[PDB]
């Protein structure tokens, strides 16, 4: 079963399994392949659950290749990209992405979003490690439905006010959430909200936007983990937190992260944001 696969490179340490650069055997192409991480045998839905996710394709989403459910254990036989956002933007630091490019890249999640959306699936931990490109310039979303399949230092930064306020259902909005962090850090060169801890995250969050009230999120001060007590600070204007971002791209950004889940926009209303009006796809200086 595995014996069709050599091994070639470690890759790196999934959420939920170790990830290997390999090689198939037989057909001889090259892929990604992670094994899945209490032993007892792959609960049935986790199995049924990835075969859903196996029919879920798009240009934008990771092809899940192959799963093999094979003497109690998993694997699943991922599509190879070379590289993925988090190294590329620290390989670009001192230039910065061209705005073009993060245009394009922003473009092309919003497309596989929608896609997972309109699918009734969600990512859940967007960040830019899962985040990986190609040399033609394509961008795609990894680990999309993973987190449903199974239920789980974890990096906050990306991580939406709702989730870190104990909602218990999360809604295609923490995705937008995500994806909108991760806008601005491609923009500015710096991690919008670096937390360290949940309420360290929350608090630089509430520091930057202003502590939300019923005003503008109806119902926070109902969450499990609100606190009257929490401290009061004021919101902050956007042209201060990411320049050189246009009025465009700051209006859209503004929108993808509202404090309220059902107010923040949707992913196929952002794509028609005149943001992307001049969107094209260049190509990215990758040298591997
Ligand atoms: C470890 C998990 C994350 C995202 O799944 N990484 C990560 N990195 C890649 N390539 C970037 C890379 C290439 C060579 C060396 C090091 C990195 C990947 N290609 N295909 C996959 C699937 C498992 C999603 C993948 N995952």
Not at 60 to 77: A, F, P, S
Not at 150 to 169: H, Q, S
């Amino acid at each position: 079963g595995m014996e069709n696969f050599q091994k070639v490179e470690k890759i790196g340490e999934g959420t939920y399994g170790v990830v290997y650069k390999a090689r198939n055997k037989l057909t001889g192409e090259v892929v990604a392949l992670k094994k899945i991480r209490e032993t007892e045998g792959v609960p049935s839905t986790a199995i049924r659950e990835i075969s859903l996710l196996k029919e879920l394709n798009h240009p934008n989403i990771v092809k899940l290749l192959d799963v093999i459910h094979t003497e109690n254990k998993l694997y699943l036989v991922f599509e190879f990209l070379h590289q993925d956002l988090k190294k590329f933007m620290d390989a670009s630091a001192l230039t910065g992405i061209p705005l073009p490019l993060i245009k394009s890249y922003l473009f092309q999640l919003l497309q596989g979003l929608a896609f997972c959306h309109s699918h009734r699936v969600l990512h859940r931990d967007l960040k830019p490690q899962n985040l990986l490109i190609n040399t033609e310039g394509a961008i795609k979303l990894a680990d999309f439905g993973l987190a449903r399949a199974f239920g789980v230092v974890v990096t906050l930064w990306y991580r939406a006010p709702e989730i870190l306020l104990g909602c218990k259902y999360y809604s295609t909005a923490v995705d937008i959430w995500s994806l909108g962090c991760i806008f601005a850090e491609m923009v500015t060169r710096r991690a919008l909200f670096p937390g360290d801890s949940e309420i360290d995250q929350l608090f630089r969050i509430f520091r930057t936007l202003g502590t939300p009230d019923e005003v503008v999120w109806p119902g926070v001060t109902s969450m499990p983990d609100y606190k009257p007590s929490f401290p009061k600070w004021a919101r902050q204007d956007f042209s201060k937190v990411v320049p050189p971002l246009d009025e465009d791209g700051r209006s859209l950004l503004s929108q993808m992260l509202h404090y309220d889940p059902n107010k923040r926009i949707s992913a196929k209303a952002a794509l028609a944001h005149p943001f992307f009006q001049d969107v094209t796809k260049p190509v990215p200086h990758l040298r591997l």
